[PDB]
Design a protein around this ligand. Structure first.
Ligand SMILES: CCCCCCCCCCCCCCCCC[C@@H](O)O[C@H](CO[C@H](O)CCCCCCCCCCCCCCC)COP(=O)(O)OCC[N+](C)(C)C
Ligand SMILES: CCCCCCCC/C=C\CCCCCCCC(=O)OC[C@H](COP(=O)(O)OCCN)OC(=O)CCCCCCC/C=C\CCCCCCCC
Ligand SMILES: CCCCCCCC/C=C\CCCCCCCC(=O)O[C@H](COC(=O)CCCCCCC/C=C/CCCCCCCC)COP(=O)(O)OCCN
Ligand SMILES: CCCCCCCC/C=C\CCCCCCCC(=O)O[C@H](COC(=O)CCCCCCC/C=C/CCCCCCCC)COP(=O)(O)OCCN
Lengths: 347, 303, 113, 105, 98, 114, 99, 129, 70, 83
């Protein structure tokens, strides 16, 4: 599409998210979600092919259903208290409908099914935007009304999301489905700490976004969407594979990497509330994510796979487009554990 | 006696369209250097009755494979809407005095396209369905500009009440305040009723014909009330009724004149006409008629 | 060409001036009608209060007659903590009256055309 | 999450549409203006937890005004007892409640 | 809570369930979404008119507008999907699998 | 919680103004000019007390003042007033603007009499 | 009530006349013997839908004119009409009104 | 009492939703939705919402379901909770709706931007290629 | 000549006179020889209700003049 | 100068409808900010009494508030009669 049109659509997506995050009226939050949905579809359908159209249709259906449920919860809450301000829910039925709608918007289990489908359908840039920027608004709304949420339902969905992400990522050879299931598991980790500390939710979101940005930019640079395609990257650009391996180590939560910071803190926070069993199950389940990250690391940099003859031609050329923020993203997603107490900045 | 009022409003409209058939045929005959029907009846006056009797006794060609449901429903909806549009009309006293009369008539007019859609879809023919789709697109296209012109003109009135239009025009006709909107409104009414130069498309056919001709008379009566305001004396409304009927007859005869005078458009030509000549002028004149009462300090009373 | 546009603009201006005058007169007439309504309003308010209180009193007396034998019932017990006056609903006034005037008080304005 | 741009800039982008007791056009009051006004004045600055525990009288009155559950229960009880007594034959409604009263202006 | 509100909410739940079965015809999915918004409009209008909250007379209109815009987008998407297969059957979108 | 207090049926009895809305509209301007003080006292009491039960005496005063106003009209200007309110009663909107002549007759009659 | 009675009468008269028309000639015995999916018309329908939505936004204008904030409402109404014109212009220049 | 006409209208609304929620022959589902929309407009109008009921009945029925059917054609207890006073010499619903231009400046801005973006998005999506 | 058209037109005129005229007469017959009272805005409705109450025969149009003021 | 006049003359030929529409829209945008009667419209709108004028409880410290509608002080509508 026209670059001016693309810029306008991206700025409309961002303006919808900002309208969600700056408003105090439920109607304006709903309008921000609507604007974001409206401007998101062409971005997903930018590279026109039937797969992207199918993904855009699935995304539109799920997000429109979530918006309808959100409006239903808003109207019930208005019925039981003539309030439009985002604060308390004022009704058990309105809070359940609201949590369901926001979980469907985020992709939390049991509403996770659309995430791998849409992420596989769309390109790598659309998947980057979808898995990073589209979580800011529902999570901000959840952070605002967290004192209303029933901890049982939120914790159930968080544990389900962690389990589903772990088990579903084990079976994947496509990189985009791996990213989708990783996103699902990280959403589960984020929403399990909302009832206790929203600061830890925001910290986990920041760390996850940094790691996901680095991972997607590395995947775009070495333009591979398949495990075997990524196995060829060492014969052209081994440093990219090494950075990818260290980033995958960070994504698995292995200390002393950056990805260890959220889970640790989250576990720490949950122990202050006499919650012991659930963090233990969460860590043991995140071991599965680490396992399939290790499988990818084996396939990418730790061993050298067979190549093809035509690769020699690729040795003679350099990337025309380079990413300005990729080195900063790699360093931030790898080496910020010593700076952990800075989380008091209420990020 | 509300039932008596309803019947004395409805039966005369049907008789009026019955004789509108004769009046149109004879007027175009005399405009074509000939005479219309002057054999059946003293001056052709029995021609509509003969046509009705002939049509009501002819075999009804049910398509034998179509959906009988929609086939029956479409004429029902057509007649019901055509007769309902006459309810809020103030001549001078309306049968059903409503606050949002204009809005109600707009909503009924919006419903009017379902009959076309259902008749096309239940005809069991690809070509008839294509024709129905073309007609529906033309109708919705021109109802956009009808709605905008209508709200622009009502900005001079103060409300959507149809009776207030009599008070708004007690000294001067609304034709002088805004003739360009009136011209575009007249052309849009021609294009809505699928009338020449925009006519690009036994029992049920008779009901469809009755609905269309009732719609023609209704549109002309609404135009007369909207733009050619008759003075109403509260102690003798017969003068207002006479003036209103005369203006409605003049406008209907003007439709007949136009049908006799011009060739017809192509589909793309009338689509282009609307979307690239009427819509921009309609929007500009809507801005002008929004700003004019504020510029001149002449905002109408009711709020 | 020029003459046609001149005639159109001139007739537009004449219509604009006439409508300016007439609509200013209509504004003044509306203000006068509003003045009359304002002058009449206090009597209507007094009658409204008297009628509402009288209907409430009739309801209270009939409730006292009816619920004489209900054990835990208190006659005329408020449902609100506050002692401040609360405007009664439609069903508080016409609850015990006949169906036709219930329909009247509920839908007479809506159904009047 | 919530970035209070309106409070920082003093803009009032959407605060005019949040409560019933806030400056309606033509000074038209909400049906429960007094109850909402009392509940808001009770809970101002006190905070969510303390407002939940300590302003329950005002909020209960506000909810009763909004939904009128208790009033409908009481009316239904009175009418049910009236029907029982009129079926059993020991009560007769007055001409006031039968349509034979003298209406007043 | 009156019975009318419960009837409208149960209509909303029925429309949502219909959107959830997915017999076929993504067209029917769009119909179910539109029924859901119709119920939303009706119940919000009833609540706002009942309590005489004058300013929220805005929001049904707003809701209406936005929902219809969504519908337009959805219809467009439908066409393109049909433009690939010749029909709007739900089971045709089985290319991407979990 | 608590028992609502209501005035007795005898407490709500008053000499009622039994003229129709057309007569009231015809008289409204002079009525507002003449009976301003009791009406203003009642309305001030009504928005200050926020309670119908605290304002009954003022309502009885406004009723009495309206009765006095209409009695003076009846004694002095009966026939022009009857013609004027017959005007107002004919019209379905009860417009003032249709028969300014009877209004002028009534106005000059009350100006010369009272 | 009166509007319901009028609607009922119109529907009943239309139905009765249709049924007598469809059943009178059925008393005497007689012989009693695709894919293309044009895209332009869909765009016409969608354009009508969007402009009709903006019409719905413009409908409260007759009452918006008595607010004492005439400058603000005039600005906002002109803004709405300007964006309507801008939608028309954008669809025009992108070859969206062509046959 | 007309046997709680609101109750009948609500039950007919739910019955219509059940009827078209089975989704047989999507034109029949759309027709059931037309009848349901008419019933809902009747509910709102009988409640006293003249303008909003007419908005539904015009926008929803006459534009949106019309476009839906066009696209498909191409392919294969009461009376109690109410008020006591009056509204003056105006209607509160009309005043609240008309306040959109004086009170709802932010709403108008965001809604207009969203509608323009919707036009642009429709063009981009249906461009094809 | 052209005037031969006039008869049929005249018929329509009569058919179009009947509704309006009829309504007026009916409004004069069911409303006591006067215009039917218009009630938008809920204040005129209160006026009609008060007139109906003070009439004594449950008809609003029966107007109580100054002779009823004692 | 020459280019702009040439462009406008070229538009007035083969595109007169767009020229007229743009001129009318621009006039609608511009003229209200220059007309002297817009303030008169604002004053007329503020002078329409939709609500009952609630009296003020007098305390002996309001010379400018009348006791009777006939009293000289208070807003006047003579300007509106003059229009
Ligand atoms: C300060 C930040 C500016 C830069 C960032 C912009 C962020 C997004 C752009 C949208 C924000 C624009 C600011 C407008 C906020 C609306 C509120 C403010 O303007 O006050 C209004 C003032 O209204 C003004 O007329 C605002 C008119 C400006 C709108 C026209 C153009 C808007 C375009 C903005 C971007 C939209 C998309 C891009 C368009 C090209 C309220 O009117 P007022 O009378 O005081 O109060 C009414 C209440 N009463 C009744 C009690 C009195
Ligand atoms: C189809 C016609 C539906 C619209 C009918 C009513 C439209 C209207 O505006 O009249 C409302 C009228 C008066 O309102 P105002 O004009 O604002 O002034 C009166 C206050 N003094 O009051 C009413 O609404 C009474 C009638 C409402 C109930 C019935 C309305 C229509 C409902 C039809 C339901 C059945 C639909 C079946 C499918 C329909 C598919 C075409
Ligand atoms: C000082 C302040 C004033 C503010 C400014 C106002 C000035 C107004 C100046 C302009 C107003 C004119 C607008 C009127 C509508 C013009 C639309 C138009 O011109 O479109 C035509 C189309 O017009 C038609 O073709 C319509 C013909 C349809 C047949 C109808 C026969 C016409 C005669 C019937 C009589 C009309 C009666 C009108 C009054 C009705 C009263 C209700 C252009 O088409 P083309 O010539 O083919 O060129 C396009 C390619 N570039
Ligand atoms: C700033 C005020 C804005 C509000 C007022 C306007 C309201 C409605 C008007 C805008 C509607 C949308 C307009 C869309 C413009 C489309 C232009 C276009 O590309 O069409 C041209 C047709 O016209 C053009 O050539 C493009 C525009 C040319 C300039 C038009 C006028 C520009 C401004 C003139 C007036 C300036 C100010 C007023 C002064 C008037 C003198 C007193 C091509 O024709 P096609 O249909 O594509 O056919 C292709 C085969 N030939």
């Amino acid at each position: 599409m026209n670059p001016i049109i693309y810029t306008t659509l991206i700025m409309t997506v961002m303006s919808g998210t900002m309208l969600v995050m700056i408003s105090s009226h439920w109607l304006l939050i709903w309008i921000g979600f609507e604007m974001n949905l409206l401007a998101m579809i062409p971005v997903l359908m930018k590279n026109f092919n039937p797969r992207a159209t199918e993904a855009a249709t699935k995304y539109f259906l799920t997000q429109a259903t979530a918006s309808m449920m959100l409006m239903m919860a808003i109207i019930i809450n208005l019925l039981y208290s003539g309030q439009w301000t985002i604060t308390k829910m004022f009704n058990p039925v309105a809070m359940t409908m609201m949590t369901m709608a926001l979980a469907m918007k985020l992709g939390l289990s049991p509403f996770h099914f659309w995430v791998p489908e849409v992420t596989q359908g769309i390109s790598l840039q659309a998947g980057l935007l979808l898995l990073t920027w589209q979580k800011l608004a529902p999570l901000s709304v959840l952070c605002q009304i967290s004192q209303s949420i029933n901890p049982n339902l939120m914790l159930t969905m968080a544990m389900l999301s962690i389990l589903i992400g772990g088990w579903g990522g084990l079976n994947q050879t496509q990189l985009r489905k791996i990213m989708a299931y990783s996103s699902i598991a990280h959403m589960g980790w984020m929403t399990a700490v909302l009832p206790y500390n929203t600061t830890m939710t925001i910290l986990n979101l920041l760390i996850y976004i940094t790691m996901t940005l680095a991972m997607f930019m590395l995947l775009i640079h070495s333009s591979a969407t398949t495990t075997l395609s990524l196995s060829h990257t060492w014969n052209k650009m081994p440093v990219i594979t090494s950075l990818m391996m260290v980033t995958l180590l960070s994504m698995g939560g292995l200390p002393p990497l950056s990805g260890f910071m959220p889970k640790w803190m989250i576990i720490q926070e949950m122990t202050k509330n006499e919650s012991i069993i659930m963090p233990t199950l969460m860590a043991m389940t995140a071991l599965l994510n680490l396992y399939f990250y290790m499988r990818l690391a084996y396939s990418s940099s730790l061993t050298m796979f067979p190549s093809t003859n035509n690769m020699k031609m690729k040795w003679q050329f350099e990337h025309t487009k380079q990413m300005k923020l990729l080195p900063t993203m790699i360093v931030l997603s790898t080496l910020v554990l010593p700076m952990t107490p800075a989380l008091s900045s209420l990020n | 006696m509300f039932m008596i009022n309803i019947l004395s409003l409805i039966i005369p409209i049907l008789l009026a369209v019955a004789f509108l058939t004769l009046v149109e045929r004879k007027v175009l005959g005399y405009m074509q250097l000939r005479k219309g029907p002057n054999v059946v009846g003293p001056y052709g006056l029995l021609q509509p009755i003969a046509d009705a009797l002939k049509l009501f006794t002819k075999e009804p060609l049910r398509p034998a494979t179509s959906s009988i449901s929609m086939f029956i429903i479409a004429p029902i909806l057509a007649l019901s809407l055509a007769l309902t549009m006459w309810v809020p009309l103030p001549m001078p006293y309306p049968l059903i005095n409503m606050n949002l009369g204009v809005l109600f008539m707009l909503a009924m007019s919006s419903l009017a396209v379902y009959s076309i859609l259902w008749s096309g879809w239940a005809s069991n023919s690809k070509y008839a369905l294509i024709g129905a789709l073309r007609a529906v697109a033309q109708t919705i296209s021109y109802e956009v500009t009808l709605a905008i012109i209508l709200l622009s003109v009502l900005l001079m009135n103060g409300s959507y009440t149809l009776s207030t239009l009599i008070t708004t025009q007690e000294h001067i006709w609304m034709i002088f305040t805004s003739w360009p909107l009136a011209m575009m409104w007249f052309i849009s009414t021609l294009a809505e009723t699928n009338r020449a130069p925009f006519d690009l498309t036994a029992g049920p056919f008779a009901m469809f014909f009755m609905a269309e001709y009732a719609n023609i008379i209704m549109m002309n009566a609404f135009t007369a009330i909207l733009f050619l305001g008759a003075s109403h004396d509260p102690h003798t409304p017969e003068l207002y009724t006479i003036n209103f009927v005369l203006k409605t007859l003049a406008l209907t005869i003007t439709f007949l004149w136009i049908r006799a005078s011009y060739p017809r458009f192509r589909y793309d030509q009338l689509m282009h006409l609307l979307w690239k000549s009427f819509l921009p002028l309609t929007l500009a004149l809507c801005m002008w008629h929004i700003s004019l009462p504020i510029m001149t300090a002449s905002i109408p009373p009711q709020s | 060409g020029y003459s046609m546009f001149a005639v159109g603009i001139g007739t537009l201006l004449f219509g604009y001036w006439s409508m300016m005058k007439w609509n200013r007169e209509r504004r003044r007439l509306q203000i006068e009608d509003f003045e009359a309504r304002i002058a009449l309003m206090p009597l209507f308010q007094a009658e409204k209060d008297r009628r509402v209180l009288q209907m409430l009193r009739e309801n209270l007396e009939e409730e006292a007659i009816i619920m004489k034998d209900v054990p835990d019932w208190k006659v005329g017990e408020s449902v609100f903590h506050t002692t401040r006056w609360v405007t009664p609903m439609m069903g508080e006034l016409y609850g015990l009256r006949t169906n036709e005037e219930i329909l009247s008080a509920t839908y007479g304005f809506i159904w009047y055309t | 999450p919530f970035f209070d741009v309106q409070k920082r800039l003093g803009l009032d982008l959407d605060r005019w549409m949040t409560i019933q007791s806030a400056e309606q056009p033509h000074k038209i009051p909400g049906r429960c203006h007094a109850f909402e006004k009392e509940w808001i004045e009770c809970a101002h600055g006190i905070g969510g937890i303390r407002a939940e525990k300590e302003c329950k009288i005002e909020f209960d009155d506000f909810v009763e005004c909004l939904l009128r559950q208790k009033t409908m229960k009481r009316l239904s009880a009175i009418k049910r007892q009236r029907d029982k007594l009129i079926k059993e034959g020991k009560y007769t409604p007055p001409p006031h409640h039968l349509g034979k009263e003298d209406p007043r202006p | 809570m009156p019975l009318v509100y419960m009837n409208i909410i149960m209509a909303f739940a029925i429309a949502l369930a219909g959107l959830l079965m997915y017999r076929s015809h993504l067209m029917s999915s769009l119909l179910c979404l539109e029924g859901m918004m119709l119920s939303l409009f009706i119940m919000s209008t009833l609540i706002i008119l009942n309590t005489h909250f004058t300013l929220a007379n805005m929001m049904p209109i707003i809701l209406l507008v936005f929902a219809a815009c969504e519908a337009a987008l959805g219809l467009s998407l439908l066409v393109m999907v049909s433009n690939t297969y010749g029909t709007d059957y739900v089971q045709n979108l089985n290319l991407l699998q979990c | 919680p608590g028992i609502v207090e209501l005035p007795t049926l005898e407490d709500l009895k008053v000499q009622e103004v039994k003229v129709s809305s057309s007569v009231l509209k015809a008289a409204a301007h002079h009525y507002g000019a003449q009976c301003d003080k009791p009406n203003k006292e009642f309305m001030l009491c009504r928005w200050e007390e926020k309670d119908p039960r605290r304002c009954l005496e003022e309502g009885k005063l406004v009723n009495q003042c309206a009765l006095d106003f209409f009695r003076q009209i009846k004694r002095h200007c009966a026939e022009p007033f009857t013609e004027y309110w017959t005007c107002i009663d004919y019209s379905g909107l009860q417009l003032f603007r249709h028969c300014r002549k009877q209004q002028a007759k009534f106005d000059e009659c009350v100006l010369d009499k009272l | 009530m009166n509007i319901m009675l009028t609607l009922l009468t119109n529907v009943t008269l239309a139905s009765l006349l249709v049924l007598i028309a469809f059943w009178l000639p059925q008393l005497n015995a007689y012989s009693e013997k695709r894919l293309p999916f044009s895209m332009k018309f869909f765009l016409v329908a969608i354009t009508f839908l969007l402009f009709d939505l903006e019409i719905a936004l413009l409908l409260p204008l007759p009452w918006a004119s008595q607010t004492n904030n005439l400058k603000t409402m005039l600005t906002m109404a002109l803004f709405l009409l300007i964006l309507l014109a801008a939608s028309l212009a954008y669809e025009w220049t992108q070859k969206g009104l062509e046959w | 009492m007309t046997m709680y006409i609101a109750f009948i209208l609500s039950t007919i609304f739910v019955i219509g939703f059940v009827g078209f929620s089975s989704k047989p022959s999507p034109i029949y589902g759309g027709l059931g939705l037309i009848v349901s929309g008419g019933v809902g407009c009747g509910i709102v109008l009988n409640f006293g919402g003249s303008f909003l009921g007419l908005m539904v009945f015009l926008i929803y029925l006459g534009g949106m379901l019309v476009v839906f059917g066009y696209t498909t054609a191409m392919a294969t207890g009461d009376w109690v909770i109410y008020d006591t006073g009056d509204s003056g010499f105006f209607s509160e619903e009309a005043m609240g709706i008309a306040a959109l231009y004086s009170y709802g400046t932010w709403l108008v801005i965001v809604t207009g931007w969203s509608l323009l973006i919707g036009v642009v998005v429709i063009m981009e999506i249906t461009r094809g290629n | 000549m052209w005037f031969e058209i006039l008869p049929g037109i005249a018929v329509m005129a009569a058919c179009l006179f009947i509704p309006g005229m009829a309504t007026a007469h009916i409004h004069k017959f069911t409303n006591g020889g006067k215009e039917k009272r218009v009630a938008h805005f809920s204040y005129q409705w209160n006026l009609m209700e008060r007139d109906r109450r003070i009439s004594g025969v449950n008809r609003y149009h029966v107007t109580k003049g100054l002779e009823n003021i004692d | 100068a020459g280019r702009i006049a040439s462009f406008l003359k070229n538009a007035w030929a083969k595109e007169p409808v767009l020229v007229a529409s743009f001129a009318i829209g621009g006039l609608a945008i511009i003229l209200p900010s220059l007309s002297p009667y817009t303030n008169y419209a604002i004053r007329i709108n503020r002078a329409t009494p939709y609500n009952y004028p609630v009296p003020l409880r007098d305390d002996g410290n309001m010379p400018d508030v009348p006791s009777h509608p006939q009293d000289p002080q208070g807003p006047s509508l003579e300007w509106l009669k003059n229009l």
